[PDB]
């Protein structure tokens, strides 16, 4: 959205850094730019497809006779969405549907209740007819398929994807907002999946302790086969220094962003082959500034 013609020098440098980082990430991920654009796209093609038509037919047949008070609409609709959209697990479809309801896809903001009502009232399976809302239905189905493309491309585990959909704040997304499929969020989701894979067999306990407010420096150090004092002091150094967002003892291992910052401190320390106090001494050498002595 920002124009290059009217931009600040620091803003241009930030844009250069963002482009370089994303290009490097795409090269590491064996991903084309078009794939990233598809995963991060918001505009959806409003054209009925045989796959979308089959999805509509299956959902309409399965959900016929559904009672609102007897059970949740989303839970009942999840298995048919999983069957139609080529998913391995049903709860993955349930999480995708929750995420879609938070996103409200399309030009006509679409949700499970609205989709079910449109299917119940204005949809006649097995016939090709023109409906005013049909384009919004197609957009919602395309968004659901895209959020599948997200889940499968990211490689995150099913329950951490459920946690990300239900509580973006745990993943450090802006509080009170639906999770973003922005490339900026896509890269952090990929990094989270890579960290979970690195944890190996310990990942099962680490994720459970992370979903509770239970995870600590010592448990995570045992998981990563690192020194507990190393992680504790890296967390201390991160707390002492001004990060954005700020890191505090009550979020340092509760939120994924604070954990990522602590792990970045650890990575930089081990790159330099020094303790995190070494990086703390290094970052004090801001000698080309007027903000501080």
């Amino acid at each position: 959205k920002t124009n290059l013609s009217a931009i600040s020098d620091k803003q241009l440098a930030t844009l250069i850094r963002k482009l370089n980082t994303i290009t490097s990430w795409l090269h590491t991920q064996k991903w084309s730019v078009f794939q990233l654009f598809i995963m991060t796209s918001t505009s959806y093609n409003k054209t009925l497809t045989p796959e979308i038509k089959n999805l509509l037919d299956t959902v309409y047949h399965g959900l016929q006779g559904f009672d609102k008070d007897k059970a949740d609409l989303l839970h009942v609709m999840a298995p048919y969405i999983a069957a139609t959209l080529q998913l391995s697990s049903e709860n993955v479809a349930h999480s995708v549907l929750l995420w879609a309801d938070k996103l409200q896809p399309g030009d006509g903001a679409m949700t499970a209740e609205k989709f079910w009502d449109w299917l119940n009232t204005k949809y006649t399976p097995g016939s090709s007819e023109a409906v005013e809302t049909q384009e919004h239905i197609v957009q919602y189905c395309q968004a659901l398929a895209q959020l599948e493309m997200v889940y499968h491309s990211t490689g995150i585990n099913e329950n951490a994807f459920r946690l990300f959909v239900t509580k973006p704040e745990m993943f450090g997304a802006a509080t009170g907002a639906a999770p973003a499929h922005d490339a900026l969020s896509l890269i952090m989701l990929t990094r989270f999946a890579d960290w979970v894979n690195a944890l190996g067999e310990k990942a099962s306990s680490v994720l459970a302790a992370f979903e509770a407010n239970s995870l600590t420096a010592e448990q995570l150090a045992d998981a990563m086969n690192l020194d507990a004092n190393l992680l504790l002091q890296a967390s201390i150094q991160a707390q002492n220094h001004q990060h954005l967002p700020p890191v505090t003892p009550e979020n340092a291992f509760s939120c994924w962003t604070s954990i990522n910052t602590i792990l970045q401190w650890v990575n930089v320390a081990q790159q330099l082959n020094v303790a995190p106090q070494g990086v703390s001494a290094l970052v004090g050498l801001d000698y080309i500034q007027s903000m501080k002595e």
Binding site: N54, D57, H61, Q64, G65, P125
Partner: protein
């Protein structure tokens, strides 16, 4: 659907339909069609036994001579003794009124036949028991003596 008719007869729930269309899908060669139909039958049986109860089986003698003697004056009450013996003499005549009339048949092969018609509403059978016992009353078997 043939079982649907039986359930909608044994229980008065003409509105209740359990077999739903789309159990056969040509996209997937119609696979699982019989397992959807089987689930529909399992739901139909569950609801059928859920709703069934032992009904008060009752019997009532109906006297045609007494009923035809009893219908309102403007309908012309008559005991069958003095009209059976005269309608047999001549079949063109008629007796009674409304659905309680006694007259010969109308259809081309029934002009000789003599039929006595009785209205169920005029039989006043429903009030013979309190309405609290049962909202609906249905005929299970009809036996005649001559």
């Amino acid at each position: 659907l043939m079982a649907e008719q039986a359930y909608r007869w044994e229980l008065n729930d003409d509105s209740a339909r359990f077999i739903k269309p789309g159990a056969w899908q040509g996209t997937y060669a119609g696979l699982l069609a019989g397992e959807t139909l089987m689930l529909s039958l399992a739901q139909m049986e569950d609801a059928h036994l859920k709703r069934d109860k032992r009904a008060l089986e009752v019997e009532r003698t109906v006297s045609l001579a007494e009923v035809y003697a009893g219908l309102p004056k403007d309908n012309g009450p008559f005991s069958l003794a003095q009209e059976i013996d005269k309608l047999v003499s001549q079949g063109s005549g008629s007796a009674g009124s409304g659905n309680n009339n006694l007259a010969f048949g109308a259809g081309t092969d029934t002009k000789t036949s003599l039929q006595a018609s009785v209205s169920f509403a005029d039989l006043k059978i429903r009030e013979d028991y309190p309405a609290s016992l049962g909202k609906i009353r249905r005929i299970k078997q009809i036996s005649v003596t001559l």
